[PDB]
From a paper:
Besides this, a functionally active construct (dDATmfc) was also used to obtain a structure complexed with NE. The NE-bound dDATmfc structure reveals clear density for NE bound within the primary binding site of the transporter. Interestingly, the binding pose of NE does not resemble that of DA in the binding pocket despite both the substrates being catecholamines. However, we observe that the NE catechol group binds in the vicinity of subsite C in the region between TM6 linker and TM3 with no conformational changes in the binding pocket in comparison with the outward-open substrate-free form of dDAT. The para-OH group of the catechol ring retains interactions with the sidechain carboxyl of D121 that undergoes a rotation of 16° along the χ2 torsion angle in comparison with the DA-bound structure, to facilitate interactions with NE. Clear density for the β-OH group of NE is observed in the primary binding site and the β-OH group faces the solvent-accessible vestibule. The binding of NE in the primary binding site resembles a lock-and-key association in comparison to the induced-fit interaction observed with DA binding.
Neurotransmitter transporters of the solute carrier 6 (SLC6) family enforce spatiotemporal control of neurotransmitter levels in the synaptic space through Na+/Cl−-coupled uptake in the central and peripheral nervous systems. Here, we employ the Drosophila melanogaster dopamine transporter as a surrogate for the norepinephrine transporter and determine X-ray structures of the transporter in its substrate-free and norepinephrine-bound forms. In this study, we employ dDAT as a surrogate of hNET to study the interaction of NE within the primary binding site.
Numbering used by the authors:
A (entry chain A): 25 to 161, 203 to 601
B (entry chain H): 1 to 219
C (entry chain L): 1 to 214
Write the structure that this text describes.
Amino acid sequence: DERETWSGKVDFLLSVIGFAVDLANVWRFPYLCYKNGGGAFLVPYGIMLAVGGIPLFYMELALGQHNRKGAITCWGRLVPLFKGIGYAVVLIAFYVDFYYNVIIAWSLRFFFASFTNSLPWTSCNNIWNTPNCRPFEGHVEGFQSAASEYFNRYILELNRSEGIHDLGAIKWDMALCLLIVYLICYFSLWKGISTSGKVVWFTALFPYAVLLILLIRGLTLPGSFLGIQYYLTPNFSAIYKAEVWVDAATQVFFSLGPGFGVLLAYASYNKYHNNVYKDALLTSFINSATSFIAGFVIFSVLGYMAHTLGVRIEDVATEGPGLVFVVYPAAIATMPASTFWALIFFMMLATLGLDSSFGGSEAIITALSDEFPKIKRNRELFVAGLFSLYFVVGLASCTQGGFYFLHLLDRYAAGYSILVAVFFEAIAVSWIYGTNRFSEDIRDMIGFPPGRYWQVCWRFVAPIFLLFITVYGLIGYEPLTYADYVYPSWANALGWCIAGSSVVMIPAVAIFKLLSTPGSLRQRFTILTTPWRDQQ
Amino acid sequence: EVQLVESGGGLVKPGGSLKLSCAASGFTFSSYAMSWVRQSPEKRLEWVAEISSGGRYIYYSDTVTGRFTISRDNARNILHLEMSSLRSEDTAMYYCARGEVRQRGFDYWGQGTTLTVSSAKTTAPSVYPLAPVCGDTTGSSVTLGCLVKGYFPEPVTLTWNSGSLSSGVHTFPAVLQSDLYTLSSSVTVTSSTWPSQSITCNVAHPASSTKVDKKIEPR
Amino acid sequence: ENVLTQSPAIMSTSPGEKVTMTCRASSSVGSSYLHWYQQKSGASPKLWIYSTSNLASGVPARFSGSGSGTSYSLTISSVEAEDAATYYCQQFSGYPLTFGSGTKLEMKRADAAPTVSIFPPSSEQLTSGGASVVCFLNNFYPKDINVKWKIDGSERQNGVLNSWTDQDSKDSTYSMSSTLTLTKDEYERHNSYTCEATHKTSTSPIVKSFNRNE
Ligand SMILES: CC(C)CCC[C@@H](C)[C@H]1CC[C@H]2[C@@H]3CC=C4C[C@@H](OC(=O)CCC(=O)O)CC[C@]4(C)[C@H]3CC[C@]12C
Ligand SMILES: CCCCCCCCCCO[C@@H]1O[C@H](CO)[C@@H](O[C@H]2O[C@H](CO)[C@@H](O)[C@H](O)[C@H]2O)[C@H](O)[C@H]1O
Ligand SMILES: CC(C)CCC[C@@H](C)[C@H]1CC[C@H]2[C@@H]3CC=C4C[C@@H](O)CC[C@]4(C)[C@H]3CC[C@]12C
Ligand SMILES: NC[C@H](O)c1ccc(O)c(O)c1
Ligand SMILES: CCCCCCCCCC
Ligand SMILES: CCCCCCCCCC
Ligand SMILES: CCCCCCCCCC
Ligand SMILES: [Cl-]
Ligand code: NA
Ligand code: NA
Ligand code: NA
Ligand code: NA
């Protein structure tokens, strides 16, 4: 019959914006600027964003709108020989939800920890502290800061684990937090986009209210301007070296999330003649804008720390979870009205993640709802069963050694898998399906064909951009380690199964059905590379 | 440099069928959607059918949907329109128009090709010369005529002295009456010019293989 | 179907004057999907204004366009003679694609009375058993003109074919041909043949006659 549609067009933009703007906008982009020549980093970042990042973002949004199905069904119809891409991409989204939500739980665990007059991560004189505790970050490995010890010894209890083999007790206060995450996700994704498209109003918008309050509070502290200098002081020497271009390339690729089945699913509920090209430019921009803003919010407070708290800038200008769960909370602890800044900061971190968890789950629910009507007829049923598997195995990550498990998933779940997956997406649409067929479809939707620029980027720039990332990725491999702990050989290999279990779907499904059509080899390719539309 | 030429097109009987062709050139034919636009003899423009660049997207007017088939040969660079079950109200000049961008319209049009759907029969014109009366012979100027009566279908071609006498000529559009066109042209020259120098009417009706010259002799 | 009506249908203007014409759609049309075509007599349309207000390649600056929703307009600031044409609007946002009913833009000029010649049946036609008298009314303005046929004294109203020319591109006049067709029998049993034209340049009609004897 008729496929449902976003109750309103802002539900779509916030769902896309919510999915694209998450914690990596805060804890990686600013760091990369600070590290790769300040403002100058914007050159290769914008070039990598213009030639590689946004072309891919646009492609998947158009594909999703035009073909009107989740990732499995969609790739089945574009190039039947490569329906495997659809499986590979849904699997990668499956693995990622196994750990991405526990990081939202951390957010909530700190939020429920900030309901107090004296934030616990301030001092070095608690039952969980060592004698080597010190009040703020330093540069000597055996002497952690008061906030590093709280996060490590009270919240995680990671000190009580000897590695991936030794997971230890289950922190039920974390398990409780994780379940609150999956409950929020349920009655948001429960009834489909009718309601999901609504809650993203809060989850995608709340982070801007909090970014605004913290931007002001941060810019008005002593030392604020010094931070912005470390953030943006141009130094074009970096641009000469490939590593900057690789960090640019890699950041733009993961910050936009193209070829993950989420943009595909979200757009598939659009109206056929919607100006998906306008939407690609608007939302992709708001994503990079949000990162630029966040840098001021972060480095304002970073300079404050270096001006009044006596810490070396390079000791607090970190990336990843340490920035938001250790360094920035430590600075909040020292300013007036600390309890307020913490409560809203962790509620921002959670809403920054929920948006994106939503999208990952939807890419699965949609893809499966569109290949298995049994599932589409029993959504509430299916989703309840999905988030229960997520939660049950998620408990592995709430154990004392749980971080060792997370770190493993994080590197492998969507590591090289996703690069290969979308590399085959770019090839499929541009070379098997054909930019002609693709441009023609777009003209039928929005009135006009994509410019020659996009056709070129989809055809040549994107795939070189993509394996430019993968080649320097491989060329810099290192066995999995965390802070003096070396993962056993068996743990490493176990991750390769996770990594390759999705990628293999591509050649497997190809082989599986290439061997299932009749006739000459040439007569079987042509059957397997004739689109579904071209056969109506 | 872009160029569009329609061909095929002529008299067809009600219920008959005919195939029009548009030869494109001066651009990459395959990057551009094309449409057929017709214009009736009452001068109304009506869009008929559109075909996407790669033939995979096709829209029809409701008035032709079912009987007409747009198609394209991106190798030979030809747009086709296959018409069948033709009715009289399909009579119009058919235009081939390039229109890839809906927001930019049809930026190139051909000269068109004319479709007449009648059950009436081709018949050749009688061309009569028109010479003045014999009274009030004031010679400042003199007006001559040529009457092309009872032909079908359109068009005819009328010139004077093989096209070299073009000033002072009024050639009136044909009018259909009882399934026959009548047409006429007037030419005006100075009395010193005529009858001293001869003036002759050149009429052509290729539909009936007619090619006749009538000299204007003075009664 | 999105029906587009245009006003006025025919409209006269003097060179230099400002001319403006309108396009009304049954249903709203996005401004990027509304275009204008110019078509000169006996030629084919040319894209003229696209996306509401942009001039197509080669369209002089005296032309402009504006509008939105269901009301658009085309405006010539200082009109020239080479602007005599019919202008069609078109919406491209919904199938079926539709064109407006058009506005014919004609040129105003000084009134001018017609030159009336009358022509008896040629001898060849009379052989074939037919007799048709022709009257030319040439180079007048404005377009409206009224011919009356008189066979002897009685006016004959039936059996006539009237054709008008398009406005001449050089002197902006109109011309008209009228043809009365009788049988040879009918023709040779009458004597006086009068074609008389009534035009705004005079209340008495211009008369041309001839007797079948002389
Ligand atoms: C870092 C934050 C704070 C600022 C945002 C920077 C980017 C959003 C800018 C930098 C370079 C820009 C790009 C530079 C040029 C292009 C090509 C341009 O392509 C065309 O117009 C030609 C194709 C056609 O005919 O449409 C479309 C916009 C785009 C992608 C731009 C989109 C916006 C970009 C990515
Ligand atoms: C939506 C409703 C559902 C609630 C979900 C919240 C679950 C989080 C785990 C709760 O466990 C408690 O968390 C407190 C905070 O971490 C601890 O207080 C400890 O830390 C506080 C400061 O953070 C102090 O006020 C207390 O004195 C001190 O006992 C307390 O010991 C601990 O058992
Ligand atoms: C200094 C910082 C905090 C400024 C924050 C700017 C905020 C207000 C910006 C960031 C993202 C923007 C939203 C992006 C998307 C849309 C969809 C559009 O159709 C309606 C406006 C709306 C909803 C914008 C509202 C304003 C907005 C939320
Ligand atoms: N912004 C992309 C981010 O890495 C991400 C989060 C959750 C997901 O399910 C996913 O596929 C990707
Ligand atoms: C990825 C498979 C997860 C299984 C969920 C439970 C299925 C319930 C069928 C209604
Ligand atoms: C920090 C970037 C996100 C994880 C990437 C894992 C593989 C990197 C290949 C270059
Ligand atoms: C629709 C095709 C399903 C392919 C069979 C399962 C893949 C084999 C992986 C080892
Ligand atoms: Cl970013
Ligand atoms: Na998010
Ligand atoms: Na991002
Ligand atoms: Na008009
Ligand atoms: Na009209």
